[PDB]
């Protein structure tokens, strides 16, 4: 499960998530799974989806994960007053903007990557679309 | 040729005649004799050799017995005592187990006076090559 | 029969599975192997 091995600071301002995605082409594989919505992918989400596409291909071909959850998310538990300090880091997300290539894959037939990316797509909280490598 | 009228296959080797442990219970009962599996069975077995399994046609309109006339021995039965091993596929394709040759089986396959495919003694012969493959040997042709 | 808010799967559980729009719901009929029937909906209010 992905997580920064170490970081400069423990916690991070909430911030916002406007803008379009960077890194928008299939730049490693042959096929890609691309983001259509704006939002958060958790380290567990990336994993639930990664397993499925890897199940799906019987660990053939090759898989790239283009996103990484480097954003620490905190939460305040039950029975806690507001304030008295910032919550504790509980999990990690990567921020997703429309257009982010999430996963790439190659070494498999077009038909099979689609099944596999379809299977992962069911694990994610944002709409996605299936893409291909392109000259230029 | 006409339709469906009694016909089943299930033995092990022809140098026997009716054995028990294979089938025993299930080898005839819509007018077919278990006990009779001899007179007809060895109606052409003794006259050549004992040790190629040849199953064969029933035939029962509403009779109490059956006749059938037999045909040629199988093909797989030509890869234990004539060309290579018996463990069969062994481990069919992790190593290549053993091997045959172009000479081997062409003659033996080529004595079939009642079974195979093709007027070319070679096409039918080439087909026989495929079985040897089912158990992962080698091509030396 | 089972309900389901999705027939993508229950439509292909068998060759005679059809999909029909009786009244205004979508039923997956299959009159040979009925156990494979489904609907998408469940009535008015």
């Amino acid at each position: 499960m992905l997580q920064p091995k170490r970081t400069k600071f423990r916690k991070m301002h909430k911030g916002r998530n406007r803008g379009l995605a960077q890194g928008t082409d299939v730049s490693f594989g042959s096929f890609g799974l691309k983001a259509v919505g704006r939002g958060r992918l958790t380290a567990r989400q990336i994993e639930a989806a990664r397993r499925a596409m890897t199940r799906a291909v019987k660990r053939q071909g090759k898989i790239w994960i283009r996103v990484f959850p480097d954003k620490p998310i905190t939460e305040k538990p039950l029975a806690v007053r507001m304030g008295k300090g910032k919550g504790n880091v509980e999990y990690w997300v990567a921020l997703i903007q429309p257009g982010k290539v999430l996963y790439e894959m190659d070494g498999v037939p077009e038909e099979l990557a689609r099944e596999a990316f379809k299977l992962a797509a069911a694990k994610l909280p944002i709409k996605t679309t299936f893409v291909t490598k392109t000259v230029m | 040729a006409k339709k469906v009228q009694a016909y089943v296959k299930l033995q092990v080797a022809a140098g026997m005649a009716n054995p028990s442990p294979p089938v025993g219970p299930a080898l005839g009962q819509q007018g077919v004799n278990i006990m009779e599996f001899c007179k007809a069975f060895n109606a052409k077995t003794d006259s050549i050799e004992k040790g190629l399994p040849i199953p064969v046609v029933i035939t029962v309109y509403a009779d109490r017995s059956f006749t059938f006339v037999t045909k040629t021995p199988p093909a797989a039965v030509l890869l234990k005592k004539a060309a290579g091993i018996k463990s069969g596929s062994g481990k069919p394709n992790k190593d290549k187990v053993g091997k045959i040759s172009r000479a081997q089986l062409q003659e033996i396959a080529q004595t079939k006076a009642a079974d195979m495919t093709g007027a070319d003694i070679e096409a039918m012969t080439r087909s026989i090559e495929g079985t040897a493959r089912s158990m992962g040997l080698v091509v030396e042709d | 029969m089972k309900v389901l808010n999705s027939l993508r799967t229950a439509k292909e559980r068998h060759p005679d599975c059809q999909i029909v729009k009786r009244k205004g719901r979508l039923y997956v009929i299959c009159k040979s192997n009925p156990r494979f029937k489904a609907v998408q909906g469940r009535k008015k209010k």
Binding site: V36, P98, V135, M136 | - | -
Partner: protein, 94 residues
């Protein structure tokens, strides 16, 4: 071989370009060599299909603007972030 029909842009900037794309057209640009760049407007559907054959990105295409012929090669392309659409193209005079 590939033949593309273009009109010169009469406007420029973000508003105009967003309006061009709202009209199923899209801006593009022609540059290179001694002549000045030529801002042009292309038909979206027609060019989408053309550029869907790898041949497009390596063969010399011909753009037609007022019955004059410009020989170019595709040089860059900006695509929609997530739709099968084109936002813009660079052509260089071959």
């Amino acid at each position: 071989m590939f033949t593309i029909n273009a009109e010169v842009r009469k406007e420029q900037g973000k508003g105009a370009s967003r309006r061009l794309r709202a009209a199923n057209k899209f801006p593009a640009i022609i540059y290179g060599g001694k002549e000045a760049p030529l801002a042009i407007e292309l038909d979206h559907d027609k060019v989408m299909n053309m550029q869907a054959k790898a041949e497009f990105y390596s063969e010399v295409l011909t753009i037609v603007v007022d019955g004059k012929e410009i020989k170019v090669k595709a040089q860059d392309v900006q695509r929609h972030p997530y739709k099968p659409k084109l936002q813009h193209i660079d052509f260089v005079r071959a």
